[PDB]
Curated annotation (Swiss-Prot):
Residue numbers of N6-(pyridoxal phosphate)lysine PTMs: 110
Swiss-Prot/TrEMBL keywords: Lyase, Pyridoxal phosphate
CDD domains: D-Ser-dehyd
Cofactor(s) needed by this chain: pyridoxal 5'-phosphate
GO biological process assignments: D-serine catabolic process
E.C. code: 4.3.1.18
Protein name, as recorded: D-serine dehydratase
Lineage of the species this protein comes from: Bacteria, Pseudomonadati, Pseudomonadota, Gammaproteobacteria, Enterobacterales
Family of the protein in this entry: Belongs to the serine/threonine dehydratase family. DsdA subfamily.
GO molecular function, one term: pyridoxal phosphate binding
Domain of life: Bacteria
Subunit structure: Monomer.
Organism encoding this protein: Salmonella typhimurium (strain LT2 / SGSC1412 / ATCC 700720)
Length: 417
């Protein structure tokens, strides 16, 4: 029992070990200009990513008719009032739902990171082999010659969820030999989804092979960051203002960190210091909260302090942070908070009731954020927020999965609240 030593210098570590619903507002959070140099990336890197996906748009158009891999944004005012009732706290401003749960390919946030990793790797090779240029129409990549080119290479991932689902599906559509290693206890539908695209799912109980790696890959991060500029266009189309007078609070589910980090960077680049991002994690897997708060990042894990890392949020069940995401983005995060499985399960049902939207438990992490921001007068005083500014604010909950989850599984999720 050497975890008691850390609990001395870091008071909040007591609540995390006790599985207490914690809400930590970052005192060392700052403007874009001051946060930027730590990120390791720049706007141009995102501009490249935007124009990468612009080049693959003709390819993806034909490949998956369901397609730009982008989700709608919708106001969820009935859900707002329901949260106000159940938990008490008033929610000032409009609440919006980002439905990355309904993205093409993998019905999840990974559709941004996963696909982009695959496409960028596939592009790189094609350019290096002298079979393609950046001025070519990327529909060429569907040809039998290019399928044969890609079959020469291979991709591999260890994931029982949306990472292996996204990489798996996209890698196969390109032409790669794809292999997703998985536990046999994983749900059969995901194995079936993968194998219908020609993926080799290996079940348990090399210079040619590219491994994904969510802990370090900047490519994934930059792929997520493409969401920022797209959201700005949606907001412009809907006559929605993001300003000092109209602040934008964003609530992002967090697993290892890549997803919400990349999105938060891209949003920061898009909307400046009037965007205010937050990470949401399960009480049983608070790795990014634990890593940022202590400053130990990837050095410390949730298992070390005695937390089991077991939770209904399968996508968020990550015991150790990415590390670089913590050091890179911490300054651009206004706060981090936890919520227990029952809170996710209950909100998941109320969202279905009030809005007719069905998500997986992990997606409901951001939903708790709004009332926790509105409750804290410490946070509002710390960031110089007036009461009128709060009233004209936009609270954007970021849903990260649900669209492809079959009925049987969704019926399982709904029977808990
Ligand atoms: Na986590």
């Amino acid at each position: 029992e050497n975890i008691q030593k850390l609990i001395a210098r870091y008071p909040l570590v007591e609540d995390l070990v006790a599985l207490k619903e914690t809400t930590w507002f970052n005192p060392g959070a700052t403007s874009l200009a001051q946060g930027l140099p730590y990120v390791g990336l720049t706007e141009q890197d995102v501009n490249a990513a935007h124009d990468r996906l612009a080049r693959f748009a003709p390819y993806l158009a034909k490949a998956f008719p369901q397609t730009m891999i982008e989700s709608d944004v919708v106001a969820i005012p009935a859900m707002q009032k329901r949260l106000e009732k159940e938990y008490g706290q008033t929610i000032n401003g409009e609440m919006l739902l980002k439905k990355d749960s309904h993205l093409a390919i993998s019905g999840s946030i990974k559709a941004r990171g996963g696909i982009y990793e695959v496409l960028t790797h596939a592009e790189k090779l094609a350019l290096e082999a002298g079979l393609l240029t950046t001025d070519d129409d990327y529909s060429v990549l569907l040809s039998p010659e290019f399928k044969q080119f890609f079959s020469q290479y291979s991709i591999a991932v260890g994931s029982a969820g949306n990472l292996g689902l996204s990489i798996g599906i996209m890698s196969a559509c390109i032409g790669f030999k794809v292999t997703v290693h998985m536990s046999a206890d994983a749900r059969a539908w995901k194995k079936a989804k993968l194998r219908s695209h020609g993926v080799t799912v290996v079940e348990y109980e090399d210079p040619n092979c590219f491994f994904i790696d969510d802990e370090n890959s900047r490519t994934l991060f930059l792929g997520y960051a493409v969401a920022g500029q797209r959201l700005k266009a949606q907001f412009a189309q809907q006559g929605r203002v993001v300003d000092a007078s109209h602040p934008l609070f964003v609530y992002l589910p967090c697993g290892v960190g890549g997803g919400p980090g990349g999105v938060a960077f891209g949003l920061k680049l898009a909307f400046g210091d009037n965007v205010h991002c937050f990470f949401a994690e399960p009480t049983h897997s608070p790795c990014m909260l634990l890593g940022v708060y202590t400053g130990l990042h990837d050095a410390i894990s949730v298992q070390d302090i005695g937390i089991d890392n077991l939770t209904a949020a399968d996508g968020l069940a990550v015991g150790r942070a990415s590390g670089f995401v913590g050091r890179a983005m911490e300054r651009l995060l206004d706060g981090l908070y936890t919520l227990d499985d029952q809170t996710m399960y209950d909100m998941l049902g109320w969202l279905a009731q009030e809005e007719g939207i069905r998500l997986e438990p992990s997606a409901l992490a951001g939903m708790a954020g709004p009332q926790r921001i509105c409750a804290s007068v410490a946070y509002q005083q710390r960031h110089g927020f007036s009461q009128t500014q709060l009233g004209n604010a936009t609270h954007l909950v970021w849903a990260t999965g649900g669209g492809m989850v079959p009925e049987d599984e969704m019926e399982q999720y709904l029977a808990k609240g």
